[PDB]
Short mmCIF file of C-alpha atoms (C1' of nucleotides) and ligand atoms in Angstrom, two decimals:
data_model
loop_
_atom_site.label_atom_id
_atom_site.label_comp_id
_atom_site.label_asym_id
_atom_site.label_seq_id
_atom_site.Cartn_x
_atom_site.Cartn_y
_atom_site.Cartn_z
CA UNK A 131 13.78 27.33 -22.29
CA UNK A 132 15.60 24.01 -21.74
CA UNK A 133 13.27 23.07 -19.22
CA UNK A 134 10.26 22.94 -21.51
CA UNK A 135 12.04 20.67 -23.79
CA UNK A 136 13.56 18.76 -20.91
CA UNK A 137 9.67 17.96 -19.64
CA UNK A 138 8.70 16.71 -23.37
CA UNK A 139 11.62 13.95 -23.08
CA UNK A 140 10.57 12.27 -19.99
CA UNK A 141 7.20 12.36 -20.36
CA UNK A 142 7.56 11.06 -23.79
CA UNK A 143 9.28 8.23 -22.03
CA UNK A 144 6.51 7.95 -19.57
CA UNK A 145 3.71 7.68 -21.99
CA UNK A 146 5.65 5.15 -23.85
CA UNK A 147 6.25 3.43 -20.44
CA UNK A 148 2.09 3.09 -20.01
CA UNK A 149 1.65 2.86 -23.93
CA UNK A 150 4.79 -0.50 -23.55
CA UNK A 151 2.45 -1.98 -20.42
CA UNK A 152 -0.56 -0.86 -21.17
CA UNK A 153 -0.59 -3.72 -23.85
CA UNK A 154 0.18 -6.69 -21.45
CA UNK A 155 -0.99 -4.48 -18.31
CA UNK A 156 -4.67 -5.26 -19.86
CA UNK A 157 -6.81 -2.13 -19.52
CA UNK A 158 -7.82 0.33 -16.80
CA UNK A 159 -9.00 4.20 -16.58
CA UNK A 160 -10.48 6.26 -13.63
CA UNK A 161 -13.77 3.84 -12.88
CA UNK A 162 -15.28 6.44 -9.94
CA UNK A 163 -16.14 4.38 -6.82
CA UNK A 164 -19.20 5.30 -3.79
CA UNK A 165 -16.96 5.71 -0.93
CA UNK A 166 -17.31 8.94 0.99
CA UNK A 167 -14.58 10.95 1.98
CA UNK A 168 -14.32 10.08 5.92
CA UNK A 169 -14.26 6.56 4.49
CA UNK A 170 -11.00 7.31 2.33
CA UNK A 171 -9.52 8.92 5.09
CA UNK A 172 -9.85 6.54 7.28
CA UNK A 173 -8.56 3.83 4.57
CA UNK A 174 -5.47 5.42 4.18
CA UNK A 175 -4.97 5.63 8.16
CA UNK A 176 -5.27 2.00 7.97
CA UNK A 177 -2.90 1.18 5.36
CA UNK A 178 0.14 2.72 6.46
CA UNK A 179 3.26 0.14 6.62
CA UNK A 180 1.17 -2.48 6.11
CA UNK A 181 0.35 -4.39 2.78
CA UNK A 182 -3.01 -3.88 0.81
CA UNK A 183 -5.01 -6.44 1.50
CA UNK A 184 -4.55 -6.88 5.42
CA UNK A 185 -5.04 -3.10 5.67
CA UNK A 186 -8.32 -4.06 3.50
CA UNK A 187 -9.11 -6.79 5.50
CA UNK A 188 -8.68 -4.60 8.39
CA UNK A 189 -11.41 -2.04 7.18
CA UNK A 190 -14.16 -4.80 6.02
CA UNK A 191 -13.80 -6.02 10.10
CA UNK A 192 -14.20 -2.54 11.08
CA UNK A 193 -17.11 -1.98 8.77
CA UNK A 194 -19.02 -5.43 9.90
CA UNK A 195 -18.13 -5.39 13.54
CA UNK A 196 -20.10 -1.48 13.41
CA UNK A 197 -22.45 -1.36 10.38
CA UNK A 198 -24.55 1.43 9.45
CA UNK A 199 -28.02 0.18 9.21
CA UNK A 200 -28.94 -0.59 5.96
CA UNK A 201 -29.50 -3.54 4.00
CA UNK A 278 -23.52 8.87 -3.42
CA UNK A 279 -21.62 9.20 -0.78
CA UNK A 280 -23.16 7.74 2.33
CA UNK A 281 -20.40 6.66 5.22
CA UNK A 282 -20.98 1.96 5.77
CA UNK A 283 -19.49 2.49 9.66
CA UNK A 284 -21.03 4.32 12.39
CA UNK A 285 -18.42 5.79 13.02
CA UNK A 286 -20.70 8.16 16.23
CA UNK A 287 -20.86 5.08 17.51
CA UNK A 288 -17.10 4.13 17.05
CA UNK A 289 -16.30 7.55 18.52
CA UNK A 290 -18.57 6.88 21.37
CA UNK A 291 -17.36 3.09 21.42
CA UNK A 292 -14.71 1.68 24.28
CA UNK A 293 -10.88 1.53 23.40
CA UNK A 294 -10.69 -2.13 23.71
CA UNK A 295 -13.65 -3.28 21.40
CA UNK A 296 -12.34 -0.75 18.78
CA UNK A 297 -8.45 -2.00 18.79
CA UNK A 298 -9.75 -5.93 18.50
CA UNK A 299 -11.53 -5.68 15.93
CA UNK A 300 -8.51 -4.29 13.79
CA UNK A 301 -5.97 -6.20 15.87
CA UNK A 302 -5.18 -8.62 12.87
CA UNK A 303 -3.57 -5.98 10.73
CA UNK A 304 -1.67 -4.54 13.56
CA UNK A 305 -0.52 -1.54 15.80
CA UNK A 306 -3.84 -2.26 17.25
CA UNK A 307 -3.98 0.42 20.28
CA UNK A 308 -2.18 2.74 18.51
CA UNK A 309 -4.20 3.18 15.53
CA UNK A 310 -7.48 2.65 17.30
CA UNK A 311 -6.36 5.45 19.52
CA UNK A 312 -5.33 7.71 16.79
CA UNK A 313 -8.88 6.56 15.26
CA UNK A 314 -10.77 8.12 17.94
CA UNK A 315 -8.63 10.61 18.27
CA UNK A 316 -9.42 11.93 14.94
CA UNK A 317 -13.13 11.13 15.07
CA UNK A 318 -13.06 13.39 18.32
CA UNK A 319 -11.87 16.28 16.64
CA UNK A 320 -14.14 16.56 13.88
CA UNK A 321 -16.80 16.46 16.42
CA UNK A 322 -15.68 19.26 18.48
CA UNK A 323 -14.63 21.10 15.55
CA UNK A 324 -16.75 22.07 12.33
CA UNK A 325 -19.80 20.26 13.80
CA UNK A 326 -20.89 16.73 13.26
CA UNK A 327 -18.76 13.96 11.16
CA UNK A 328 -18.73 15.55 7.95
CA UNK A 329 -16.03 16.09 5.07
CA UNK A 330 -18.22 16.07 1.58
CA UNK A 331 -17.17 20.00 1.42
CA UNK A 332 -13.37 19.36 1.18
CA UNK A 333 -14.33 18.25 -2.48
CA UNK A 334 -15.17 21.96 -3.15
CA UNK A 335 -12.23 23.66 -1.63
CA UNK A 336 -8.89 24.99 -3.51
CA UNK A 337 -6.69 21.66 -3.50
CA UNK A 338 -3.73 23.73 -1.55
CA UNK A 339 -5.80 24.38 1.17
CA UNK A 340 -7.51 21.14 1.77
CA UNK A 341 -4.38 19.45 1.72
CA UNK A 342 -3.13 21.74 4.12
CA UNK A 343 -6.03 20.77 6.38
CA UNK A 344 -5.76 17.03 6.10
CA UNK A 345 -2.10 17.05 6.68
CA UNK A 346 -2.90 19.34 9.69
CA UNK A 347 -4.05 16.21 11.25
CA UNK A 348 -1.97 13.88 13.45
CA UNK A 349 -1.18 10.38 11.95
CA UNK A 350 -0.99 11.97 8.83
CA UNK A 351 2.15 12.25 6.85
CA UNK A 352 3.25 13.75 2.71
CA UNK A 353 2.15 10.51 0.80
CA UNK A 354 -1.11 9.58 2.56
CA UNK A 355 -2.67 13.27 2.04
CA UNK A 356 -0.98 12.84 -1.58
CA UNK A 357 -2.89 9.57 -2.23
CA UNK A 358 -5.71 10.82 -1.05
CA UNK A 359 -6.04 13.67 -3.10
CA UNK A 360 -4.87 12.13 -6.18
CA UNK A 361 -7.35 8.88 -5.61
CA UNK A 362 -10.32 10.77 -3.71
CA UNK A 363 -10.68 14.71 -4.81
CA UNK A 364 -9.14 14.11 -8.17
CA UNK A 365 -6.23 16.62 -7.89
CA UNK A 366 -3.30 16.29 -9.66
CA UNK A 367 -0.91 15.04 -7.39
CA UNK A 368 1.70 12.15 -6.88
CA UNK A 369 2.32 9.70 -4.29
CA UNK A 370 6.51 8.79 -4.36
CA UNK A 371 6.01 5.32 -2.46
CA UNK A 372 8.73 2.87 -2.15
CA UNK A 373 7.36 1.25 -5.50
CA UNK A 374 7.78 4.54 -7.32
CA UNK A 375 11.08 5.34 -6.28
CA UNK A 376 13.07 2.27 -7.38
CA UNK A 377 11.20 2.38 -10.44
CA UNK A 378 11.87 5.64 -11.41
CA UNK A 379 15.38 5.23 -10.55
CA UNK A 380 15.93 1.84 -11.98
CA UNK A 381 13.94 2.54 -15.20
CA UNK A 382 16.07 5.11 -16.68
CA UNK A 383 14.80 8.03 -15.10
CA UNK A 384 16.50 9.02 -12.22
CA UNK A 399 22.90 -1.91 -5.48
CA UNK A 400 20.53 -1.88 -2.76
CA UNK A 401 21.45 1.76 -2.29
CA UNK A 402 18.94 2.90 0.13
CA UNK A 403 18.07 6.60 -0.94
CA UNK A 404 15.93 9.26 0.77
CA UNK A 405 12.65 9.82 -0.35
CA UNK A 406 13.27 13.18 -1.82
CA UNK A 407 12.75 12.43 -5.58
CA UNK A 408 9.88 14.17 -5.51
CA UNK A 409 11.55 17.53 -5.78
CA UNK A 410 12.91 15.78 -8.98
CA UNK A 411 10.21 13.24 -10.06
CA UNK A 412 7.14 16.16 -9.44
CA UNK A 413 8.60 19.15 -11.45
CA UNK A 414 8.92 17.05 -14.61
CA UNK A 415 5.38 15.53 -14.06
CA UNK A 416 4.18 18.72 -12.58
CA UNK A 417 2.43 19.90 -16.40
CA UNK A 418 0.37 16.40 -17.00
CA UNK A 419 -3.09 15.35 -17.82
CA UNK A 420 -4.87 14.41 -14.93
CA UNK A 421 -6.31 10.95 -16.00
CA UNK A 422 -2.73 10.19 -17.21
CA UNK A 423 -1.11 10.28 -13.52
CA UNK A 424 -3.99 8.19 -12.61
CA UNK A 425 -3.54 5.78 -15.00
CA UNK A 426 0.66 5.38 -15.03
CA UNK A 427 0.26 4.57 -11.55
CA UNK A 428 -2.30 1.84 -11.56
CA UNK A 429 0.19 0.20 -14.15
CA UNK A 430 3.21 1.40 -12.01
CA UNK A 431 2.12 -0.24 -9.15
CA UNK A 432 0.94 -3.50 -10.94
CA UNK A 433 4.44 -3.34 -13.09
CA UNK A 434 5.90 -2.87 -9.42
CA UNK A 435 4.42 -5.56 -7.71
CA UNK A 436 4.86 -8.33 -11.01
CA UNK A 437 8.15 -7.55 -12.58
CA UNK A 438 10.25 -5.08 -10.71
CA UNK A 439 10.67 -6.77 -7.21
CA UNK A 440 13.02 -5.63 -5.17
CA UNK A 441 14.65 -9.33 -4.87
CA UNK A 442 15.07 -10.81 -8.14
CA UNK A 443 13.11 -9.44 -10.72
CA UNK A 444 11.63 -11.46 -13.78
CA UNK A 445 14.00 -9.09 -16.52
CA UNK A 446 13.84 -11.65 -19.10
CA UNK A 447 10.32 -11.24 -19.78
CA UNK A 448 10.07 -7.24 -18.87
CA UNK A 449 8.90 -5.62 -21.87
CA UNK A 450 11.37 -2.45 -20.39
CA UNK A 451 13.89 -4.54 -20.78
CA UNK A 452 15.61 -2.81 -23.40
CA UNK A 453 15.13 1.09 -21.62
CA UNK A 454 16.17 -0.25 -18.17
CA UNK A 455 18.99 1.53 -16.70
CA UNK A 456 19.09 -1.03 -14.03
CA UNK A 457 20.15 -3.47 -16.75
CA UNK A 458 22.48 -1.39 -17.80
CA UNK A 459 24.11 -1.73 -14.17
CA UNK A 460 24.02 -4.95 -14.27
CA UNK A 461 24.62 -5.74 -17.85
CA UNK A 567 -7.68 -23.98 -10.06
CA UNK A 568 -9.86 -23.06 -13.37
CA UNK A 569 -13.06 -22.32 -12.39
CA UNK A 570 -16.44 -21.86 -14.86
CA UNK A 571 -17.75 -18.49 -14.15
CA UNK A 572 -21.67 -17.89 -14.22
CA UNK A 573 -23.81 -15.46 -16.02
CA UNK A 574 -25.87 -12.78 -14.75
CA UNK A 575 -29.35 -14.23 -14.79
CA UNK A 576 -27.46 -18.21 -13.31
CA UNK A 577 -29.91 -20.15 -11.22
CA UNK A 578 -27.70 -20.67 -8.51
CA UNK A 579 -27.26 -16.62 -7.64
CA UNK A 580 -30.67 -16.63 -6.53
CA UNK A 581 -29.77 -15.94 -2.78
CA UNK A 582 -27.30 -13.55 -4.09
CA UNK A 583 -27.61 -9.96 -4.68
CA UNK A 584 -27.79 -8.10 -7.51
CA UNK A 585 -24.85 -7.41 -9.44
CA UNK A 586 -23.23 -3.92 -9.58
CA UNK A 587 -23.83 -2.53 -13.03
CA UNK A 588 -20.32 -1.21 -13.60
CA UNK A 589 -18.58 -3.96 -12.36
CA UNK A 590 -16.57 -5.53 -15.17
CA UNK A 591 -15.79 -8.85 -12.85
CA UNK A 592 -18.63 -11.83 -13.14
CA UNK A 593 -19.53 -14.06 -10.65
CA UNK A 594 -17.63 -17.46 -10.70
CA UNK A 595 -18.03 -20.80 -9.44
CA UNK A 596 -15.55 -22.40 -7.42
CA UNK A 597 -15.90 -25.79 -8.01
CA UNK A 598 -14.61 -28.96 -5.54
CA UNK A 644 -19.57 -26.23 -4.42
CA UNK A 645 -18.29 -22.89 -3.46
CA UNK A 646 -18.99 -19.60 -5.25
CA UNK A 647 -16.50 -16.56 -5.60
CA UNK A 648 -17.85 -13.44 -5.37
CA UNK A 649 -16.71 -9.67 -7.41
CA UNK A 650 -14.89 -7.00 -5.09
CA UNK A 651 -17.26 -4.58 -6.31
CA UNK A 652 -20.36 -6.37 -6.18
CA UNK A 653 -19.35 -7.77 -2.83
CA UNK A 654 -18.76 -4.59 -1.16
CA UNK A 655 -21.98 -3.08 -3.23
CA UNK A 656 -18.98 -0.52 -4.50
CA UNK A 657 -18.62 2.65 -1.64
CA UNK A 658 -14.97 0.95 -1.21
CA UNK A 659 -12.41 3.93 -0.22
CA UNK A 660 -9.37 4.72 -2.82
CA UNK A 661 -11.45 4.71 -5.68
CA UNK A 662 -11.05 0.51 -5.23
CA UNK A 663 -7.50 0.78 -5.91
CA UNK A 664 -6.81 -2.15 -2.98
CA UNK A 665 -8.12 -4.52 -5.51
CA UNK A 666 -6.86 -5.78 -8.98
CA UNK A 667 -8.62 -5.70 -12.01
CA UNK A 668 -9.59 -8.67 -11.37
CA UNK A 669 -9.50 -9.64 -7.71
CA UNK A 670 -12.53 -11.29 -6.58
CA UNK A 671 -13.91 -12.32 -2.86
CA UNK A 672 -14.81 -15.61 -1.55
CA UNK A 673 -17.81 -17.03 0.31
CA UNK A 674 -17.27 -17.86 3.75
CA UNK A 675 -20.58 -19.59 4.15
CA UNK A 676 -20.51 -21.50 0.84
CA UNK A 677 -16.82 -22.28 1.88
CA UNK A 678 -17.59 -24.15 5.73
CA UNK A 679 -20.89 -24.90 4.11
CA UNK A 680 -20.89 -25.98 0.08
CA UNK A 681 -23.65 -25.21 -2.29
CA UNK A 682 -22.84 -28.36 -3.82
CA UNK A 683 -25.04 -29.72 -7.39
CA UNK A 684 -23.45 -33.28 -8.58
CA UNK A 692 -16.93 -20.58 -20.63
CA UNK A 693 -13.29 -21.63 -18.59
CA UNK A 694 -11.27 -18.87 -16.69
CA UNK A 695 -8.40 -19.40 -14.90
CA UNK A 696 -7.73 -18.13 -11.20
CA UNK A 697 -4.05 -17.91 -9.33
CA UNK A 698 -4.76 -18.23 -5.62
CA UNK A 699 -1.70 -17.47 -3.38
CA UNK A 700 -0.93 -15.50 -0.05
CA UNK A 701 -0.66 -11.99 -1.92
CA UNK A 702 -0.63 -10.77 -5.13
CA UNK A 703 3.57 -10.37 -5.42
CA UNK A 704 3.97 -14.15 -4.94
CA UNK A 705 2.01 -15.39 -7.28
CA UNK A 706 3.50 -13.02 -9.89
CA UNK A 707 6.85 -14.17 -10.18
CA UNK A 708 6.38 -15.77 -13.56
CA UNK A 709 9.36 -16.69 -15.82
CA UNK A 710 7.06 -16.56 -18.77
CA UNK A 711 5.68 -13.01 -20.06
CA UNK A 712 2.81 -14.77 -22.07
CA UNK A 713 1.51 -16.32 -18.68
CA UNK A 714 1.50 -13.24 -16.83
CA UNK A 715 -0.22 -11.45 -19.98
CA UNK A 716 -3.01 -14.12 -20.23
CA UNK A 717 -3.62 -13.89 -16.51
CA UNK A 718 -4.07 -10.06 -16.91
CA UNK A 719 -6.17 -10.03 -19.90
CA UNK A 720 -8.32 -13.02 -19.61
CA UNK A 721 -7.76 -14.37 -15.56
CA UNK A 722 -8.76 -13.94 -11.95
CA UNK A 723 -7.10 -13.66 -9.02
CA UNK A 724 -8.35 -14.20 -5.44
CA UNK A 725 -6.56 -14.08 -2.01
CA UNK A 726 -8.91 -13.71 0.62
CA UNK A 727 -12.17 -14.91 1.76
CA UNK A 728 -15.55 -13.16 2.83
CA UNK A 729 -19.24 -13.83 4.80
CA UNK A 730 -22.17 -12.65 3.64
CA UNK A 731 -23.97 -12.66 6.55
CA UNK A 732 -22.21 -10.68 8.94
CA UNK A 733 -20.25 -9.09 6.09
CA UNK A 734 -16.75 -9.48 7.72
CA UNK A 735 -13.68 -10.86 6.14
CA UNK A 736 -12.72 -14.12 7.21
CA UNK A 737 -9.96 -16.62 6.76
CA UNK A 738 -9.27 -18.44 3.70
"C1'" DA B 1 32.55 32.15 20.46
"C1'" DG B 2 29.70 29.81 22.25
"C1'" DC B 3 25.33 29.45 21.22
"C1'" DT B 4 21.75 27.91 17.36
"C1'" DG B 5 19.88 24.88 14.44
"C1'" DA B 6 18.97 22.44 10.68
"C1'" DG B 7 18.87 18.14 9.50
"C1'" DT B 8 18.90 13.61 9.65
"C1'" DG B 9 19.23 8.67 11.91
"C1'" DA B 10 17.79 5.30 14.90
"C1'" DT B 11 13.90 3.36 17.37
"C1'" DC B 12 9.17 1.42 17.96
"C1'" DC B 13 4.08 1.27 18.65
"C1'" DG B 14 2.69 -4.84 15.64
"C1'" DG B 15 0.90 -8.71 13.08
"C1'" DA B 16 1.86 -11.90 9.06
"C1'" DG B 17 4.18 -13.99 5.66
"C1'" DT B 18 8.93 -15.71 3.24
"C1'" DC B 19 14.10 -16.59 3.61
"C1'" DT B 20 18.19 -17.86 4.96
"C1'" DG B 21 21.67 -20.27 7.23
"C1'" DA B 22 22.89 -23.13 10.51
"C1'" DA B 23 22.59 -27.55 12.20
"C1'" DA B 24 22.23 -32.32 11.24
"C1'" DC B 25 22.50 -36.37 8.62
"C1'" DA B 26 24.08 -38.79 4.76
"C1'" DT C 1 14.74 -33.11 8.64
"C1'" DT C 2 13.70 -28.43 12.23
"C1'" DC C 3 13.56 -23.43 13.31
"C1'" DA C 4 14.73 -18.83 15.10
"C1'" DG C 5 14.94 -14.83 14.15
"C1'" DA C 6 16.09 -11.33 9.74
"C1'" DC C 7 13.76 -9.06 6.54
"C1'" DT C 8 9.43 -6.64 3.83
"C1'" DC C 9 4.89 -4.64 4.09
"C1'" DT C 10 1.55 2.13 -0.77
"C1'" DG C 11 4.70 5.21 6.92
"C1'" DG C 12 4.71 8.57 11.47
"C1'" DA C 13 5.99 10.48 15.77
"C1'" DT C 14 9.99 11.12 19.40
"C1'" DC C 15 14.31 11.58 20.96
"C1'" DA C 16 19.06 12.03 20.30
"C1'" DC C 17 22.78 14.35 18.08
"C1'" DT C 18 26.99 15.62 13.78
"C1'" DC C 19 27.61 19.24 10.40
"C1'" DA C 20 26.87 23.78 9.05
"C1'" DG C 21 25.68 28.81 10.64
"C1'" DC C 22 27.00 32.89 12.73
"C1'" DT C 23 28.34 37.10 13.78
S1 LIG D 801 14.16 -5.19 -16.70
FE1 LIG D 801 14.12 -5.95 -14.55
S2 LIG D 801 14.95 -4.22 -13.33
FE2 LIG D 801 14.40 -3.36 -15.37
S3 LIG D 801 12.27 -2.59 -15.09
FE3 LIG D 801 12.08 -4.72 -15.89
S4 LIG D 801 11.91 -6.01 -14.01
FE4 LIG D 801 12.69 -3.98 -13.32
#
DNA sequence: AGCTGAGTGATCCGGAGTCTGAAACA
DNA sequence: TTCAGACTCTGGATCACTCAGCT
């Protein structure tokens, strides 16, 4: 059948497209996260036209202005109290990222309906469902369109799925697979049937690269083709032709801070003048939603307190600090870009430890 | 035939950055 | 040197309305 032998060509090319990146796009493979499923959800209601790390930002505010009391999937916001929580409190708190009432309103909204339906705030047993079906349910929810339920399933249940974002579909189309043309979002019905007979762990993985590859090289305005390494397989082409010293485990100075996450590859740095940068995953104790894919490889938090306040005593990494991770990116080297990858850091954002809320850099 | 209707295209609930061009001045 | 919008940002829900559909 020619379609058989039409799926082995592409996703040749798409194996070769990780295998190409994979090599500058360091290394990364499904690393499972602690976030429960009500926590996903509500991750990818707050990320929707909005970039990552405000719609991050926007969840770490929710989670510190209601925190579960604490010091497996266990839910880090009350979210009965949310529910039970005034309008105006609710769409403050998230006001910095945006469509404040409306989300907060949709937010309750939701949370009101799985109370008076199926019981008590509850979704671990959508993880044991047919995928069909529990997609069918999510999407039955308002707020909820085709590529959130898609990432979700993909990131959270482990399906085999594929969200067709705006990064995906100008690099499929530009990378000699499928101007400023603006097209439709219907490549799916193209894109899915040749991907739809793949392994699992490799949609996973193409897209962590595809969305790093995305957000370095392929820009919409003016992207860095000299040092693409698809250079020579772009169709698009074709068309147109500070250093900081980080600390050890067992440091002195970590005393006050808490343990470190065993499978967190990240250390913990010191940001020198005395301020201290603290690991996504050891700052957020892991349980982030989206299997942590808001963060980088290497994108670590800072300290708030050690910021206003330094902890100040009178090997080398390097760390690119900028607004957001696409501005930084726009390298006209490839061997810079590949260093930072393999062997840098990259922070954007800062963080308190004692109230555990995101604050201002 | 004279009423569907399917399907798309604007619009906006909203902050927060960057980017142009205009202006201005030489 | 200002600076005011014009865009983008892992999108959805409403309302209005041109090309097919038909019988
Ligand atoms: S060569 Fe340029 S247009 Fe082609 S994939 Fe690379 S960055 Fe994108």
């Amino acid at each position: 059948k020619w379609w058989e032998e039409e799926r082995n060509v592409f996703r040749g090319r798409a194996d070769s497209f990780i295998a190409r990146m994979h090599l500058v796009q360091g290394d990364r493979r499904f690393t499972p996260w602690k976030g429960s499923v009500v926590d996903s959800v509500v991750g990818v209601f707050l990320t929707q036209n909005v970039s990552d790390h405000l719609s991050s930002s926007a969840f770490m505010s929710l989670a510190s202005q209601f925190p579960v009391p604490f010091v497996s999937t266990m839910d880090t916001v009350d979210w009965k109290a949310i529910r039970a929580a005034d309008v105006k409190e609710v769409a403050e708190t998230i006001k910095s990222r945006g469509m404040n009432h409306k989300l907060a309103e949709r937010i309750q909204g939701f949370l009101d309906r799985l109370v008076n339906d199926h019981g008590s705030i509850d979704l671990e047993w959508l993880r044991d469902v047919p995928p069909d079906k529990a997609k069918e349910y999510l999407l039955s929810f308002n707020g909820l369109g085709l590529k959130s339920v898609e990432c979700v399933r993909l990131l959270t249940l482990h399906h085999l799925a594929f969200p067709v974002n705006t990064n995906v579909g100008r690099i499929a189309v530009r990378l000699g697979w499928v101007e400023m043309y603006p097209m439709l979002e219907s490549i799916q019905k193209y894109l899915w049937p040749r991907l739809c007979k793949l392994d699992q762990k490799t949609l996973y993985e193409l897209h962590y690269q595809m969305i790093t590859f995305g957000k370095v090289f392929c820009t919409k305005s003016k992207p860095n083709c000299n040092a693409c390494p698809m250079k020579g397989e772009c169709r698009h082409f074709a068309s147109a032709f500070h250093r900081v010293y980080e600390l050890p485990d067992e440091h002195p100075l970590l005393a006050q801070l808490e343990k470190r996450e065993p499978d967190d590859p990240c250390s913990y740095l010191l940001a020198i003048w005395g301020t201290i940068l603290i690991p996504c995953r050891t700052a957020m104790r892991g349980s982030f939603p989206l299997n942590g894919t808001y963060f980088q490889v290497n994108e670590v938090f800072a300290d708030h307190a050690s910021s206003l306040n330094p902890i100040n005593v009178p090997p080398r990494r390097t760390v690119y600090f900028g607004t957001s991770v696409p501005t930084i990116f726009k390298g006209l080297s490839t061997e810079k870009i590949q260093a930072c990858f393999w062997k840098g850091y990259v922070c954007v954002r800062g963080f308190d430890r004692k109230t555990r809320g995101p604050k201002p850099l």
